[PDB]
Symmetry: C6
Subunit: 210 residues, 6 copies
């Protein structure tokens, strides 16, 4: 990634073995659960497009999702080229050429070009632009691999209300209010109806706390 | 987080894989026990609002508590906006706009704006303000998920007094003096009554030490 | 803690996840054995009062001992206030107010005040003063939770003298010379009596080495 | 590897025990799966030819592949010598001799010569040139040890389409579009034919999602 | 320990949790085998007397050996006082008082006094002097706890010569040439006698290699 | 080891607990396999003679090999003394005396003398000279402890050619071309004879790939 050292300059440093292993492990142990996205965004802090491709390449298996990720990146890169057509001409000394979509994706750009864009003044954050495309595609993976719809999350007759709300918002986070009351069991729903339409979650969970 | 480097300047650096995993692990292995709060406060030392949301997002499961956390943050952010109304006008060069509630929560603020507020002189500690809101909500989770009341923590007829005091103040810490004597078993309570009203805990535990 | 960076200035840095976990683990795996005290003193090297409270707060369970620790800290803080009464008056620019007992314990003092006292010239080491109070209370926990008295550590008829001395000074360290000879078995005691009153431990262990 | 320190100079530093163990472990636990290549490229970030040989030497077993790696490196080194014949003559002060093929492979070059080439201005990146040769040979190992051809990856009659696409692109990545439709089971292939020739992967996987 | 930072000054830094745990673990898993001594000497690199006492204090159990260690340190400290009597008088500004034996052992000396002696010019290496006393006592522990004498290490009739030499020099290292030939089995001893009196170990092991 | 800090000066720093444990572990888990040598050479990057002795001393067991290592070091040190006789005379200020063989081996040299030689200009790399002697002796250990000769590595009648070449070059690496064809099974040898005398390994392995 590109980090700031002891001085005020942004400097490239190698991706660490701890970061490489942390990303490989969270994919192996959690697949494409919703919480894998912010872990990816945090592990790729300040990452260049090269580091982003590195993290995606080190993932073995789930190649259907990774291939869908390539398709999403290609779509966003093509939209970037439509909005930012490169203007031909010799690049002035001490400057950087305009990045294409494949340059932001690290396909047709070298490392020192990515360093040049990210450490430029003003910077061209090709890492954050690429990560935005990757997270966009990864969110498409999560909603797609979400097994349960929110309409099917119903509280059991003897299920504690806390466990039901745990399953409700876990499913809701994957699929990406008043349904929480409707899908509660008869005994809890009677308590929630008499509680009021503007009750908070802690007020509702306290009322059905058995 | 925002840290001080070799020079005297406060500088942003990426959240470490060790910090990310340490927070995910303590939630998996201890849920919402009272000691999880100071671990969160320590793991988020110097954290920006972005790092605070990152730590909260990486938590899979317990979404009922995390949704209640969003409600608490929204309440505190709305109270911040009531106390600090943003005054319109162009921002002077080399300065920062006034943060809203959603800016402190990292919702409507970029990373370099959070860096700008936290490294300002005088600093606007949006990280400490947000962490104060998160810890406030997390404390509401702990007292809510506390299973046992302090009125039900009683010393067994053959339970050692040390183990009883261990259960007493562990329960008292979750729920957030003279009850300790009243809930002791008959044999120990006789010893404590004749000991005096101003006895310390080590004096009481020594007297009932069997 | 407060550490010295590349320059000669003492600078605050966040407590590390390794230090946080190392302290939580040694308490879980060794409770209040005597060797837990120097591990605490080493893990809290250069710690502020905030870091000291953090380490104590992250400990789940053993709340009877931790509550006794609060009582000891309150006693030492009250003695500090008796010896150092704060004199009222406006604090001069670039200076620090006099700390109270609760300020050294981190109760009524902010982090930058603790940084101000510890990095002052001359420094007010509120961290070392607080740690001295904590170690004092922790030593009261160790002697109190010591199960065996030194009078009951006797060498078995067939117990090797090395194992007996191992149990003797382990018990003696928890409770905090000529008794070692008296509590030896008859065969070893006969050897030690004829050895001389000023024999060293390696001379005594060699003589009873069987 | 050669890294940039606090100043702007590229400086050699020793290969870390974490990097050494991370490379040994991924070879032991994944052999020559496709994802081992980008892990090697990332673990050898900024590596000198000496570090590259070190990583290859620490691998025990798989010596057939490692011997094939030597043959590939010898071929690329001989092509480098054909394209870059060394011109004899005394080397000017403060300069570097032209590297041979065996110099880039770390065979006939010392460490400070590799430091001299890599930290030169303009630099002679003997590390990136050698790594390019190693990755080239390692890719020959992957395609060679690929057990299954893409023609034999067919969807089972009851196999979920997601699992079939997972096996398809995993095999395709090792061997290095319309075949995905042809190798689908009859029920899914009927759905894909009526879907259109320009359907994306997420559009195809959604249509056969059962 | 006392380490050199980015500048040329020797600066104190806290003992790390990794060093603390590494020393506790090697004592738990290897007790007082000979190889524990160089691990101690390496883990205490640049250690102050405070760090040396910390490492010794964190060791739970083996208190018979640790008590013998105190006796050895007291003997060496008393010999230091006999050779270096402290001369009374006011200490000049910016200087250090002469250390006693208990000052080198960290008993009657503060941390900043140990920093003052070790970072002095010329330095008074109280850490290396104390470590020399500790290693001296620890070597007395190893030879004392050595279970087997070198006279009893004999090669079995069917024991491979390599395994016999492994046991021979392992025992010899704990107790601290021609006996290796005499304690070999009859078949190997016949080969070694006809080999010559000045044969090397690899020449002897090759001759009895079966 | 001796490393370069933020400035351009070579500075000593303590051997890390990670390096100490990594060397102890690879010896415990791999003994004297060929791949242990480059792991030793990498873990001792920039090591002083003191660090080299430390790594060798921390190895428990295998004392027959370690004693043979002492004999090899003594031979190379005696050859160094024959080639470099020390010339008597007072050492000029700010200079270093000429090292003997035992000085390079760390036997009769202090740490600051090793620092003086290694950080000299021009440097006397006593660490690399000693490591060259240690690796030389360690290679004698590997060839000596190699159990199988290359003449006995033959392909089984049903053994896959890949597994046979894996055993061939693994044995060849320990003992330190046309024999690979001669030791193949009859069916594979018929294929290799008709393939040509100048076939590469990947060409031969592909031809016998069954
Ligand atoms: C190769 N490349 N090609 C693309 N688009 S394209 C014309 O349509 O094919 C594409 C795009 Cl958009 C983005 C980036 C890459 N990129 C990758 C990618 C990263 C990646 C992106 C992603 F979104 C998911 C993912 F896992 C990895 N690594 C691979 O793709 C590896 N891989 N290989 C095959 C093939 F064998 F079947 C795969 C099937 C799924 C994954 C496969 N590494 C690199 C390594 C070194 C130097 C450059 C690059 C590089 O530039 C791009
Ligand atoms: C999205 N956002 N929205 C809020 N308030 S609001 C209008 O009423 O909805 C809200 C508030 Cl107050 C604070 C902060 C966020 N924030 C989050 C939050 C953090 C968070 C706070 C918390 F207190 C608990 C927690 F776990 C996480 N992450 C999420 O909330 C993830 N998540 N998603 C759903 C949905 F799918 F059901 C959830 C249900 C429980 C948790 C859910 N990440 C971000 C990631 C990148 C850039 C910005 C942000 C961000 O700004 C805020
Ligand atoms: C709260 N506070 N109060 C005290 N003294 S007082 C009036 O008589 O109550 C007291 C004292 Cl003397 C010292 C320091 C604290 N301090 C603690 C303490 C540390 C601590 C000290 C100790 F010696 C043992 C220990 F484990 C933790 N954390 C707690 O005490 C947590 N805790 N809570 C309850 C209650 F719910 F039953 C407990 C029962 C045992 C432990 C409990 N964290 C803090 C976190 C953030 C900002 C400030 C603080 C703080 O200032 C002090
Ligand atoms: C020795 N050397 N020789 C080559 N080419 S050559 C004339 O035809 O033989 C060759 C080439 Cl091309 C590249 C580099 C090396 N190099 C190696 C290599 C690295 C390596 C490359 C590779 F592509 C695969 C791999 F695993 C390791 N280490 C070895 O090869 C170890 N090894 N030894 C035998 C023998 F005993 F059978 C082996 C059989 C397979 C691996 C073997 N380490 C070194 C260690 C210290 C100082 C220099 C060097 C060095 O310069 C080169
Ligand atoms: C206390 N002190 N006293 C000595 N000599 S003396 C008059 O004859 O008793 C003695 C000597 Cl010579 C050297 C150093 C110490 N020192 C220790 C020692 C270290 C130590 C040395 C050693 F060689 C072995 C070892 F394990 C630890 N820690 C202890 O000794 C802990 N301990 N306590 C008892 C008692 F309860 F039985 C023990 C029995 C065996 C170990 C015991 N920590 C300290 C912690 C904080 C501030 C100062 C100190 C300190 O200055 C010295
Ligand atoms: C002691 N010393 N002596 C040698 N040569 S000599 C006259 O003929 O005996 C010899 C040589 Cl050539 C090289 C270096 C050492 N050196 C060692 C050595 C390293 C070492 C070298 C090696 F090649 C293998 C190995 F494992 C360790 N550590 C030891 O040898 C430990 N050890 N002890 C006995 C005895 F008890 F049987 C052993 C039997 C096998 C290993 C033994 N540590 C030290 C620790 C602190 C300060 C100095 C030193 C030191 O200078 C040298
Ligand atoms: Cl790392
Ligand atoms: Cl995976
Ligand atoms: Cl794969
Ligand atoms: Cl831009
Ligand atoms: Cl409930
Ligand atoms: Cl569910
Ligand atoms: Cl609840
Ligand atoms: Cl990390
Ligand atoms: Cl969880
Ligand atoms: Cl979730
Ligand atoms: Cl403010
Ligand atoms: Cl009790
Ligand atoms: Cl309970
Ligand atoms: Cl008690
Ligand atoms: Cl850490
Ligand atoms: Cl605990
Ligand atoms: Cl608790
Ligand atoms: Cl003071
Ligand atoms: Cl004994
Ligand atoms: Cl006992
Ligand atoms: Cl003994
Ligand atoms: Cl490391
Ligand atoms: Cl392997
Ligand atoms: Cl091998
Ligand atoms: Cl070039
Ligand atoms: Cl499917
Ligand atoms: Cl398959
Ligand atoms: Cl699907
Ligand atoms: Cl650490
Ligand atoms: Cl132990
Ligand atoms: Cl103990
Ligand atoms: Cl001295
Ligand atoms: Cl043998
Ligand atoms: Cl034995
Ligand atoms: Cl042998
Ligand atoms: Cl370390
Ligand atoms: Cl071993
Ligand atoms: Cl040994
Ligand atoms: Cl030389
Ligand atoms: Cl094969
Ligand atoms: Cl074999
Ligand atoms: Cl093959």
């Amino acid at each position: 990634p590109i980090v700031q050292n002891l001085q005020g300059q942004m400097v490239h440093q190698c991706i660490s073995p701890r970061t490489l292993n942390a990303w490989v492990k969270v994919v192996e142990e959690k697949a494409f659960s919703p919480e894998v996205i912010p872990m990816f965004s945090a592990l790729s802090c300040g990452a260049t497009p090269q580091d982003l491709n590195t993290m995606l390449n080190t993932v073995g298996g789930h190649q259907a999702a990774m291939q869908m990720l390539k398709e999403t990146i290609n779509e966003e890169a093509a939209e970037w080229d439509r909005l930012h057509p490169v203007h031909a001409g010799p690049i002035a000394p001490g400057q950087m050429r305009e990045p294409r979509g494949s340059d932001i994706a690290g396909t047709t750009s070298t490392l020192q070009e990515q360093i040049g864009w990210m450490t430029h003044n003003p910077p061209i954050p090709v890492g954050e632009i690429y990560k935005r495309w990757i997270i966009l595609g990864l969110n498409k993976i999560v909603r797609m691999y979400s097994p349960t719809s929110i309409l099917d999350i119903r509280q059991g007759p003897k299920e504690p209300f806390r466990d039901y709300v745990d399953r409700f918002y876990k499913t809701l986070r994957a699929e990406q209010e008043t349904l929480l009351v409707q899908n509660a069991n008869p005994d809890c729903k009677t308590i929630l109806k008499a509680l009021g339409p503007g009750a908070t979650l802690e007020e509702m969970m306290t009322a059905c706390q058995g």
